[PDB]
Structures are given as structure tokens and as C-alpha cells.
Design a protein around this ligand. Structure first.
Ligand code: ATP
Ligand code: ATP
Lengths: 232, 151, 49, 73, 146, 240, 139, 101, 149
């Protein structure tokens, strides 16, 4: 490059930022996803489709692990997702080289959102088009956080993103209670993902990852075929 | 026609109202019977999609210029009733021509008629056609940005 | 909009052929009328705190 | 579209009234063209002929262009 | 140069352009009246009426030569009293980048310059003064250039 | 609509889209070429025609079938100048896998490294996003054959049989009708379908001089470009 | 002197829409293409209450529309339309009618009266040549 | 025949008696009179070349409803309205309107 | 409470306002953008007042050709002064009353004469009495500001 470095995101005359609001529009028209925190573990459930019978499902993965106990899904766009995965992978290593201890889940999200915000103020680039759902069972209590293209973190009990997320939002508002078990959380997570799905819900149309206090665990399609018997 | 849009210099508001009248009257609440409509243009790129939607304009059809045998057939049509001797190399006329237009091959049949009336000839020779194309070939190539981009 | 909620809660009880109304009838009635372009999303209004 | 003469009482059509129009093209009618000798033009005599071949012979030889099988431009 | 909807010349021109075009060939044959229409610019036109059917006899106007301009100046000088010792080689050599309007304009000025001093004749000196009076000696020393 | 400079540089639209990248998807179609990839049970076929407009032009320096490593080949569509720039990147990062890690690079991991680079060109706004496609083949240990496709947006996935180029929606529609009927796939069963799909979509029924076949096999993992004679041998064999 | 005439029509409309008489036992129905364009004083409840959207017909409605058109059509005995139901590239309702007409106009043309399940494929390929796919990017 | 006097028809009143003399069907508006009366070309599908695929397809949808609707009975399906002649210029698109007229 | 004691209080007890030394108000503007209490509050005060109520929408005075739409302006107020216990109601003064534009370009000066007449009748000649006007429209940024002093 040359030395331009001019930020292409400035304030509106109203006083809002324009490109971040447009980046949120790309997230809302993405694949639906749901995450539920249920007092012994946290369950991530995304919704994976294939436009043909020609694609392969053992290749592209949505639920992606980070350390040994920290999972991560998204709802926005695809190529930008893999960037900040590899960024967060290295970002958890400088914690572990220095402190010799697995990084707490709150400590990642402070660092990932700091990457993402500082990315928007600098010049020549667009913001990301990805929102995240990060979870983990650190120090007894499990956790569930959500980031955004603006770079703001939250702490949900149960949220949803992607298409028709407000419909899934009201559904969890009646479905979720003070506490459940892990298996009940999986049963209501498939229930809310079956809200806006299509007719074929096989072991390949959904893709589910959990966080035990024993650790992160990604579910193979065998159990998801077995657990979808009398689903929702 | 054209596309609807936002705040648009109030002259344009009328033409959208004229267009909305046309969309309603030819296909709306009433039943248009024994009536057929032939629309013809060159820029079908940006219109109202409510105008191009089927039911009112069912089958659109594209009409292409080059076939290399059509330009042979267009040439035989326009040079049908012309006095000559049959010494007409149509293939070299077809090969050397960038006419691309039945009006242009009408113009080529006009030009070779103009050279033939020069030097007092009732018949038309093949060289008149070779002068007819080169006048056509020069007249077109003295132009720039001659775009031909539809939908 | 108070009238619209009263009409929608009335219309929901009509199709059930019922002269009674619940609290939930109004909850789905307000959610019908509250249909705006400034969508909720939790991220439009929390990034600006 | 004709401007016929009408009786004021019987309303009968009896006249033709040669039907003028707007004054703007009336202002565009320029007659009495002065004869300019072609030799006033220098160096452009080929274009003069190609014009005279294009227009004047269609004006004169109306039937030479009809029996040949062509149409004047 | 059509398909361009940009303010303000996007609406008022294209119909009058079209109502021209659909009048020229159009639907019914118009073999009653001839059109000899002329421009001074080619490429700005869109290829809509620009093809054959309509205006197809492209008559380029070349730049007038030294021999063309010297011929033209001799024509406009014919109506006045001119001394016969006028070299057209010098005139064609000194006249550069003129047209028929500008070759006429020098010939009017060189006669009026001769009207000022009261002679009844002309020389090459009059026309050189007539040439210099056209542009009125365009020379600004931009002074950057050595 | 268009806000700011969303038609020009890689920023967002008010509709939550962008436009430069989806212009680049139909920057392939100015190439005027169609390539088909089919994976069988123990092979992986790449087939691609070539157009030779001039007799004064070689029949050697034309074919898009390139060789990344000794066990990985590819095919390029789109424009040609952007294609060979893409290939030198793939040749370069395959060798760095050897020098850093020691073993041969998998065909899956290479498509990540390519799609990351295409991401960045989308990402920073002051550079062009390189419109050309990418299809790889290769044999993995304890995984069999693979077929992948990088895109100028920056995403990839595995496939079973997937074409690219100009004609996909007729070519992929035929391959779906071929796969879902659950037939056998051995070697020549896989090669014959890779011809007849490209035969029926293009509707040519050609002479064995335009297409090139780049099969890789489990028994012979070397990337191999077929001879014109044996290309003619398969074509008359499927002919009844 | 034209935007004032449109504006006074709106004010005249809303007065006798809802003024001092609230004219009983009449109903007003409107049907435009874009509703984010018109006046926000029109969309208020108590003046217009039913904000009915007509979206594009999805799957499970194509089977409804195909059933109703071909209830009147004398088509083939053993053609199935189900391959052309799960298709992408969303299709408006009037397109289905055009496909059915374009099939029949092709069915007449070779002096026939019934369907051989090839004219439907031509009509489907005919009507679809437009701009297309979601590009499998940003999901 | 007062049953024909439909509320919205047009009549001719007497000048003095003012009563109805003769009813008149419609108006013409001599503006659009000029868009009716003109000759196309007396052309006969023979002043056109290389287009018989497009021509026969176009004639199929126009001629058949205005001539023989019994084929459309035997199918049942209603015929559609019309076509669009889009094309880059000079291809001969106004020449077809001569032919059908 | 503001409207009741700006309308019924000048009527029922005018001697109070004639005792301080200042004059009684006659001009009321109501505005609310979504239409909240813009007719109900009008029809209620039209109900329990025992006073004459005149409602004229600001869209009727337009009349086809010239002058006729202007002459009935003064013909209204002389009827309004004919019954001194009366209130004129205006409905949606937004079109007639926008802005005095140019005359050769758009902004046709035909309804402008009525706005000139309306402003110069109530206070152009004599300050009348027992006449209360009520104007109800939203959009208080687009109508004219001379009647807003
Ligand atoms: N394919 C063709 N075959 C025979 N004659 C043709 C053909 N195309 C054009 N012509 C000639 O063109 C003239 C008709 O004009 P034409 O329809 O070509 O203009 P156009 O295509 O309508 O132009 P535009 O598209 O700009 O309106 C006729 O005189 C005819 O002789
Ligand atoms: N305080 C209230 N109590 C009961 N209903 C109300 C109240 N405020 C508003 N409404 C309802 O709102 C609707 C609008 O009436 P309102 O007079 O408030 O505005 P409006 O005159 O219709 O607006 P506009 O002047 O734009 O026409 C009425 O149907 C009314 O029932």
C-alpha cells in the first residue's frame, strides 16, 4: 500500500455509525443458531444446510473448538468467520505461554472484541460480518457470551441469532426456566432450531457442540441421529 | 417505463403516474379481451419489474444480429429485383461485410445501384458492391463508443 | 395503538368462539402491532449505551 | 381535425378553411434561397458532387431509380 | 448518448430525440421529404439513428489545405479592387489552421486596413496585418520557461 | 441501491450485501470455458476442453491442467493472467509445508491457505479480488480421494462431483441425477460420466483433441495427465 | 405547482377518511407494491388496521397452486411436478401460470392435445433465464 | 328502445324540443385518430430473413387466439396477452410490425 | 384544562379579562405527529359547550376557477360574526398555508390569496370578539411562519 490509512467509517450527521449498522444487516440474514446455558453445561446448536446432494459434511465445520473447553459458533458470513477463529487460536496461546494456565472464557472475549473493535477504527478496511457465541465451563460455573461486528460483548442465558431470531427469542423466553439439565437443554435447543428449519432434519442438517465441566465435546452425527428421535 | 425510485424531481413523478396508469389499465381489475399488445424497445435492462412480470408480457424474445447466413439471406432479399448479369460473388460480399443490419444491407444495395448508374450502365456489376461495402465499412469505423449492451 | 390491541385480542377470541380473553391474548396483540423498522436485535440499542 | 366553415344558425358544413397551425414552424419557414455559385467553395468539390449525386438526381430522375429496383436514401 | 438517467438532461431530450427518430423511418414510409441534417460532432451520438436507414451518407469535412485556403481568399477578394501583384504562395504559406470563416475575416480586415491609409490596392503586408488582427497577437510570456 | 461507494470498493450495502465480490463470480464467465470434476471410489477425474482459435498457436502451452505437487493437481477457470498467479502461490505454500512440517501437505489444508489469501484481497479495500476459480484433486492416506473448490470470495468445501466454469446449472443438475440414483463408480465408470456430462451439456460430441484428463488413482497417487491416444481409447470404448 | 396538488389530495383523503363523522359501514382496501414509501400518517391503527403482506409463494404452496391450475388443465397421465417444487430461485405466483401456458402453447404447436413431460421442462427453462443464485457466500 | 339507453351512453338531443333523437356509441378523440390510419408496407413475410425461428414463434401466440380458439378449448388453457421485441438496434424490429399489420 | 380555560373562560367571564388590561386570546394551534388527541379533544369540547361549532377542513376552499374559492372566506366570518357565541374549527391546515414561493416557477399563487385573506381578515381590519379558532395539524416545520407570530 501507500500510506492512506484513512478510516472509511465516520459519524452520521444524526450521530450514528453507518457501516456497522449495515454489517449487522448481514448478520441478521445468515444461518440461524441457538445457544442455551443450563447450570451444568452450555449447548451450542447451529443449522447447517447444503444446496445440493453433492456437498460434503465431513469437511466444513461450524462448531469449532478453541482450547479444550471453549467452543465457538457464528451466525454471520463464512470466510470472515475463519479469520477470527485462527486469530483467537493464537490469542489463547499467549495466555498459556505466559500464565501456564487455561484462559478463562471472559478473558478471551475481552481480547477478541478488542481485536474486532480496533479493526473497525483503522483505515482502509470494512468491519466483519460475523457475530459469535462463545461458551466454556471454567472454574465450576459455565459461561455463554455473544459478540458482534461493533465489538461489544454480552452475557446471555439463552439467545439466538441468524434468521427469525426474534421468533426464537420469544420461544426461549417461554421455554427457558431458572434451571434444567444438559440433556433437557439439548432437547429445547433442537426445538427452537426446528422452529425456522425446513422439512428434512437429519443428523446432517444440524450440528451441535456441548461444554461439559469435563470439557468441550463436539457431538458426532450418530448421537444426533439418536437424540433427534422424538425431538422437540 | 423505467424503475420506480425515491424523491425524484417532480417532473419524474408524473411519468411514474403515467406508467402506473398503464400498468393498471392493460392488466388490472378489468378483463382485457381479444386484445394483444406488442411492445418493442432496445433497453430492457432497467424497467419496472412489475411491467416485465409475466401475465401481462408473457414471452419476451431476443432478436440477434449475426448469423452469417441471415446476412446472405438479407442480401438476396434486398438485391432481388435489380438488373444485373448474375456475376455476383455473394460469398465474398458476405465475408467482407460487417453490415450487421438489414437496413445496412439495404444501404449496400442502394450504393452499388448508385455506382452502376454512373458510367451509364443499366446492369449492376460486382465491383459496385465492393465499392458499396467499403463506403459502408468506412462510414461505421469513423465512430467510437458504439455500445450495444442490453440486459 | 391501544385500540389495535383491543381489536386484535377481540379477533383472537372470535375465531375460538369464546367470550373470554386471557393475558396472553393481549401479549400476542401488542407484538402484532409493535412491528417497526427499528428492529429490536438487542444490538441496535446496547452498542450505544 | 378540419376547421370547416359553419353556419351560425343551421350549423351546416359548407367551407374548408385551409387549416393553419402554431406560429413557431411558421417562423421556421425560410423561402427565397439566394443562388450561391458552387465555385465559391474551394477544395471541397468531391463532397459537392457526392451531395448532388445524392439528392438532385433523385429530384430529377424520379423514374430512373424506380425501374432499376432501388430506393434513393 | 442514451441509457443514462442523470440529472437534468435525462428526460426532456430522449423523447424529442425519439420523436425525431420515429418520424424519420418510423412505421409508415416517409418518401416525400428529404433530410440533410448536419452536426459538428460524431462520437457523442448514440448509435440509435446513427445507423443506416436514417443518415448514412457520412460527409466528413476535412481541414482546408493551403491550396484550398488560398483559393478561398482569392474568391472573397474578387469583389474588391485588388492590385494583381499578390502571391498566393506567401498567402497559403502564412495561413495556417484557418477555415473559410477566418480566411474571409482576414480578407475583410486587410481591405479595411487599406481603407484606413487610403490606398486602392492590396499587398501581402495587408494580409499579414489582417492575420495578426484576428487573434490580436496572443502572446503571454508564462516566464517559467527559461 | 447504492450508498457511498458500495459499487466501487469492497464495503457494505444498505441491503447487507456487497457487489465487487459478486461481480467477480461472473468475471469467470468472460473466460468462456467449462471444467468438470468427478470423484469416484478409487480415483478423481478432471476434464476440461480447450479452444484453439489459431492454427499458428501451439498445442502444448495452452492446457489449464497444472501440477501443484507430485500428488496434487488442479484446473483453473476464469481469466488466465489471474490463474497462473494463483498457481504460483499454491506451488509456493505446498513446499513450505514440507520445509516446516516434514510431511506431504494434505489436499484439504492447501485450500485453507488459498482461501485465506483470497479473503484478505476481499478485505482490504485498495486492491483487486482476483476473479478466477480453483479445483483440486489428490489422494489422502486413510481418507481416499478428495475434490475441493476454492472461490474468490474465500470459501471452500469438499464435493463428490462438481463442475465449474460457464455451465454449472445444467452440469450440476445432470450430476445430481447421476449421483442420487446410487450407481457403481470404479474407474472407467467415473471417466465416462465425466465425459458424457460435458458432452451432453455442451452438446458437441467432439473429436479427441480438445479435452484433457488429469486423473489420480489410489494405486498410482502421482498426478497424471492422460495422453491423447488413451483419451481416444476411453471415448471409443464407451461408444457402442 | 404539482407537489402541492398531491399534498392537498392526501389531506382531503384523510379528512373524510377520519374526521367528525367516522362514516360507518364502509371499508377501504389498498394494494401497492411498496409500503415503506408512503406517508406514515396513513399507516396508523384506527385508520388502516390490516397490514397484510403478500410474500412470494414458498414450498408447500407450489403444490397448492399446481393443483389448482392443473385441476382445469387436461395434462398428462403420469407427469409429476414434484422435481420442480423443491427448486431454488424463488418464483412468483404469476410465473406458475406462465409456465402452464407456455407448456400448452408448446403442446399445441406440434398438433397435440396432451403432455409428454418435455414441454414442461422447456417452459421451466424458458421462464428462468434471469439473474440467479445466492452464491453460497454469507450463508 | 329505451332499454338500450344505458346510464352513461351518449345521445343527440333536439335543438328545440331537446328530446332524444339518436344515441351515439362512443367518441374517437381525433388526436388518436392519427394512430390508426396509415399503411404498413404491404409486406408479406418475404422482406425478412434469418428470423423464421423467432417469427413463427411470435406468430404462434398472436394469430392462433384471433383465428382459432378451439385449439385452446381442447387444451383448456387461456392464451396470454403479448410479447416483447427487445434487441440491439437495426435488427429489424419495426419491420415485424409492418408484417403483422 | 388549558383548552377549557382558553375557550370557555373568555366566554363565560369576559369581565375578568376586561379588568386587568390585556386582550383575550383567539388563536389556538394543536399539533401532535402521530395523531394523539387531535379529534377526540375537539369533538368533546364541541359536545359540552352549548355554543355554536363550525368545522371547515383546510382542503375545501380550493374552488375550481378563480375568485370563487376566495370570496367564501369573508362570507364565512360574517356568518361567524352573525352568531357571536361560536367557534370555528380548522382541520389540517397544511396544504393551504405552506409557503409563499415564486410565481413564474412552481408554487402557484392561487390558494395563496386565501391565505392572504385569512391572515388579513381576523386581524387586518378590526380585532373582532367572541370568535375562537382552532387549528389542528402535525408537521409544524413546513407551514408558513407569518401566521405563527
Ligand atoms: N433482418 C432483416 N431482414 C430484412 N430487412 C431488414 C432486416 N433488418 C432490418 N431490415 C430493414 O430495416 C428496415 C426496418 O427498420 P428496422 O426495423 O431495422 O429498424 P429497427 O431495427 O426498428 O431500429 P431500432 O431498433 O433502432 O428501432 C426495413 O426497411 C428493412 O428493409
Ligand atoms: N386518551 C385517549 N383515549 C382513548 N383513545 C385515544 C386516546 N388518544 C388517542 N386515542 C385513539 O387514537 C385515535 C386517533 O384519534 P386522535 O384524535 O387522537 O387523532 P386524530 O385526529 O385521528 O389524528 P389526525 O389529526 O392525524 O387525524 C382515536 O381513534 C382514539 O380512539
Amino acid at each position: 500500500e501507500r500510506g492512506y490509512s484513512f478510516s472509511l467509517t465516520t459519524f452520521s450527521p444524526s450521530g450514528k455509525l453507518v457501516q456497522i449498522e449495515y454489517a449487522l444487516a448481514a448478520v441478521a440474514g445468515g444461518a440461524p443458531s441457538v445457544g442455551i446455558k443450563a447450570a451444568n453445561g452450555v449447548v451450542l446448536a447451529t443449522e447447517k444446510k447444503q444446496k445440493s446432494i453433492l456437498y460434503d459434511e465431513r469437511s466444513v465445520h461450524k462448531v469449532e473448538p478453541i482450547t479444550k473447553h471453549i467452543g465457538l459458533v457464528y451466525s454471520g458470513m463464512g470466510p470472515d468467520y475463519r479469520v477470527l477463529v485462527h486469530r483467537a487460536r493464537k490469542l489463547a496461546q499467549q495466555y498459556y505461554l505466559v500464565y501456564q494456565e487455561p484462559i478463562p472464557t471472559a478473558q478471551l472475549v475481552q481480547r477478541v472484541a478488542s481485536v474486532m473493535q480496533e479493526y473497525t477504527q483503522s483505515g482502509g478496511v470494512r468491519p466483519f460480518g460475523v457475530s459469535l457465541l462463545i461458551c466454556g465451563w471454567n472454574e465450576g460455573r459455565p459461561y455463554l457470551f455473544q459478540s458482534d461486528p461493533s465489538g461489544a460483548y454480552f452475557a446471555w442465558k439463552a439467545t439466538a441469532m441468524g434468521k427469525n431470531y426474534v421468533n426464537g427469542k420469544t420461544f426461549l423466553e417461554k421455554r427457558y426456566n431458572e434451571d434444567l439439565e444438559l440433556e433437557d437443554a439439548i432437547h429445547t435447543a433442537i426445538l427452537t432450531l426446528k422452529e425456522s428449519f425446513e422439512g428434512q432434519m437429519t443428523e446432517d442438517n444440524i450440528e451441535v457442540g456441548i461444554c461439559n465441566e469435563a470439557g468441550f465435546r463436539r457431538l458426532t452425527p450418530t448421537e444426533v441421529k439418536d437424540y433427534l428421535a422424538a425431538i422437540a | 417505463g423505467g424503475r420506480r425510485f425515491s424523491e425524484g424531481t417532480s417532473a419524474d413523478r408524473e411519468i411514474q403516474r403515467t406508467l402506473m396508469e398503464l400498468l393498471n389499465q392493460m392488466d388490472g381489475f378489468d378483463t382485457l379481451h381479444r386484445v394483444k399488445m406488442i411492445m418493442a424497445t432496445n433497453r430492457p435492462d432497467t424497467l419496472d419489474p412489475a411491467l416485465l412480470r409475466p401475465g401481462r408480457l408473457d414471452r419476451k424474445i431476443h432478436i440477434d444480429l449475426p448469423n452469417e447466413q441471415a446476412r446472405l439471406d438479407i442480401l438476396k432479399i434486398h438485391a432481388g429485383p435489380i438488373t444485373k448479369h448474375g456475376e455476383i460473388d455473394y460469398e465474398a460480399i458476405v465475408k467482407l461485410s460487417d453490415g450487421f443490419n438489414g437496413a445496412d444491407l439495404r444501404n449496400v444495395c442502394t450504393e452499388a445501384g448508385m455506382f452502376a448508374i454512373r458510367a451509364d450502365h443499366d446492369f449492376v456489376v460486382q465491383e459496385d458492391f465492393m465499392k458499396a461495402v467499403r463506403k459502408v465499412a468506412d462510414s461505421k469505423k469513423l465512430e467510437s463508443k458504439l455500445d450495444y449492451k442490453p440486459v | 395503538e391501544v385500540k389495535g390491541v383491543c381489536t386484535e385480542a377481540g379477533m383472537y377470541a372470535l375465531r375460538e368462539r369464546r367470550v373470554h380473553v386471557t393475558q396472553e391474548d393481549f401479549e400476542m396483540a401488542v407484538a402484532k402491532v409493535m412491528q417497526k423498522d427499528s428492529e429490536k436485535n438487542m444490538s441496535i440499542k446496547k452498542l450505544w449505551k | 381535425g378540419d376547421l370547416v366553415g359553419v353556419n351560425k344558425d343551421s350549423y351546416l358544413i359548407l367551407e374548408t378553411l385551409p387549416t393553419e397551425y402554431d406560429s413557431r414552424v411558421k417562423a421556421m419557414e425560410v423561402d427565397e434561397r439566394p443562388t450561391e455559385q458552387y465555385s465559391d467553395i474551394g477544395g471541397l468539390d468531391k463532397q459537392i458532387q457526392e451531395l448532388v449525386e445524392a439528392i438532385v438526381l433523385p429530384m430529377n430522375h424520379k423514374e430512373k431509380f424506380e425501374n432499376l429496383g432501388i430506393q434513393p436514401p | 448518448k442514451r441509457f443514462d438517467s442523470e440529472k437534468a438532461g435525462d428526460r426532456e431530450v430522449q423523447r424529442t430525440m425519439l420523436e425525431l427518430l420515429n418520424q424519420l423511418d418510423g412505421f409508415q414510409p416517409n418518401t416525400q421529404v428529404k433530410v440533410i441534417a448536419a452536426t459538428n460532432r460524431v462520437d457523442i451520438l448514440d448509435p440509435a439513428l446513427l445507423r443506416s436507414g436514417r443518415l448514412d451518407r457520412k460527409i466528413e469535412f476535412p481541414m482546408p489545405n493551403e491550396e484550398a485556403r488560398a483559393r478561398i481568399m482569392q474568391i472573397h477578394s474578387r469583389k474588391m479592387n485588388v492590385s494583381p501583384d499578390v502571391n498566393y504562395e506567401e498567402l497559403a504559406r502564412c495561413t495556417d489552421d484557418f477555415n473559410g470563416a477566418q480566411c474571409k475575416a482576414v480578407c475583410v480586415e486587410a481591405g479595411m486596413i487599406a481603407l484606413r491609409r487610403g490606398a486602392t490596392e492590396l499587398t501581402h503586408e495587408d494580409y499579414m496585418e489582417g492575420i495578426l488582427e484576428v487573434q490580436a497577437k496572443k502572446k503571454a510570456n508564462l516566464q517559467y520557461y527559461a | 441501491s447504492s450508498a457511498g461507494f458500495d459499487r466501487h470498493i469492497t464495503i457494505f450495502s444498505p441491503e447487507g450485501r456487497l457487489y465487487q465480490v459478486e461481480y467477480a463470480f461472473k468475471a469467470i464467465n468472460q473466460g468462456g470455458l467449462t471444467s468438470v470434476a468427478v470423484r469416484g471410489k478409487d480415483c478423481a477425474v478432471i476434464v476440461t476442453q480447450k479452444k484453439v482459435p489459431d492454427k499458428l498457436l501451439d498445442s502444448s502451452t495452452v492446457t489449464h491442467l497444472f501440477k501443484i505437487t507430485e500428488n496434487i493437481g488442479c484446473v483453473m477457470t476464469g481469466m488466465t493472467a489471474d490463474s497462473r498467479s494463483q498457481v504460483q502461490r499454491a506451488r509456493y505454500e505446498a513446499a513450505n509445508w514440507k520445509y516446516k512440517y516434514g510431511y506431504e501437505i494434505p489436499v484439504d489444508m492447501l485450500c485453507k491457505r488459498i482461501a485465506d489469501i483470497s479473503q484478505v484481497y476481499t478485505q482490504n479495500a485498495e486492491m483487486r479480488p482476483l476473479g478466477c476459480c480453483m479445483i483440486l484433486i489428490g489422494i489422502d492416506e486413510e481418507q481416499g480421494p478428495q475434490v475441493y473448490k476454492c472461490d474468490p470470495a474465500g470459501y471452500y468445501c469438499g464435493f463428490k462431483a462438481t463442475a465449474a466454469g460457464v455451465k454449472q446449472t445444467e452440469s450440476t443438475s445432470f450430476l445430481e441425477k447421476k449421483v442420487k440414483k446410487k450407481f457403481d463408480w470404479t474407474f472407467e465408470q467415473t471417466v465416462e460420466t465425466a465425459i458424457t456430462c460435458l458432452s451432453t451439456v455442451l452438446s458437441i460430441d467432439f473429436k479427441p483433441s480438445e479435452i484433457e484428463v488429469g486423473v489420480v488413482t489410489v494405486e498410482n497417487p502421482k498426478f497424471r495427465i492422460l495422453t491423447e491416444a488413451e483419451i481416444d481409447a476411453h471415448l471409443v470404448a464407451l461408444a457402442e | 405547482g404539482a407537489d402541492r396538488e398531491v399534498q392537498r389530495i392526501l389531506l382531503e383523503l384523510l379528512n373524510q377518511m377520519d374526521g367528525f363523522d367516522q362514516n360507518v359501514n364502509v371499508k377501504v382496501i389498498m394494494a401497492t407494491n411498496r409500503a415503506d414509501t408512503l406517508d406514515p400518517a396513513l399507516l396508523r391503527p384506527g385508520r388502516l388496521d390490516r397490514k397484510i403482506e403478500f410474500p412470494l409463494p414458498d414450498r408447500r404452496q407450489k403444490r397448492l397452486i399446481f393443483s389448482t391450475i392443473t385441476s382445469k388443465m387436461n395434462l398428462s397421465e403420469e407427469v409429476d411436478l414434484e422435481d420442480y417444487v423443491a427448486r431454488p430461485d424463488k418464483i412468483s405466483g404469476a410465473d406458475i401460470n406462465s409456465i402452464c401456458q407456455e407448456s400448452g402453447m408448446l403442446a399445441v404447436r406440434e398438433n397435440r392435445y396432451i403432455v409428454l413431460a418435455k414441454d414442461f421442462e422447456k417452459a421451466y427453462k424458458t421462464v428462468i433465464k434471469k439473474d440467479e443464485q445466492e452464491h453460497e457466500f454469507y450463508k | 328502445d329505451k332499454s338500450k339507453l344505458k346510464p352513461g351512453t351518449r345521445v343527440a338531443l333536439d335543438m328545440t324540443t331537446l328530446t332524444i333523437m339518436r344515441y351515439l356509441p362512443r367518441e374517437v378523440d381525433p388526436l388518436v385518430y392519427n394512430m390508426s390510419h396509415e399503411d404498413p408496407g404491404n409486406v408479406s413475410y418475404s422482406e425478412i430473413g434469418g428470423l423464421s425461428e423467432q417469427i413463427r414463434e411470435l406468430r404462434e401466440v398472436i394469430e392462433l387466439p384471433l383465428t382459432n380458439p378451439e385449439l385452446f378449448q381442447r387444451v383448456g388453457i387461456i392464451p396470454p396477452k403479448g410479447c416483447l421485441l427487445y434487441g440491439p438496434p437495426g435488427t429489424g424490429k419495426t419491420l415485424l410490425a409492418r408484417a403483422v399489420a | 384544562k388549558e383548552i377549557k380555560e382558553v375557550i370557555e373562560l373568555p366566554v363565560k367571564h369576559p369581565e375578568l379579562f376586561e379588568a386587568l388590561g390585556i386582550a383575550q386570546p383567539k388563536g389556538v394551534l394543536l399539533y401532535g405527529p402521530p395523531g394523539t388527541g387531535k379529534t377526540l379533544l375537539a369533538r368533546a369540547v364541541a359536545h359540552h359547550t352549548d355554543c355554536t361549532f363550525i368545522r371547515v377542513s383546510g382542503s375545501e376552499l380550493v374552488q375550481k376557477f378563480i375568485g370563487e374559492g376566495a370570496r367564501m372566506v369573508r362570507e364565512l366570518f360574517v356568518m361567524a360574526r352573525e352568531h357571536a357565541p361560536s367557534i370555528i374549527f380548522m382541520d389540517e391546515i397544511d396544504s393551504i398555508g405552506s409557503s409563499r414561493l415564486e410565481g413564474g416557477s412552481g408554487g402557484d399563487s392561487e390558494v395563496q390569496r386565501t391565505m392572504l385573506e385569512l391572515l388579513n381578515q381576523l386581524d387586518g381590519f378590526e380585532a373582532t370578539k367572541n370568535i375562537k379558532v382552532i387549528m389542528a395539524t402535525n408537521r409544524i416545520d413546513i407551514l408558513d411562519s407569518a401566521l405563527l407570530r
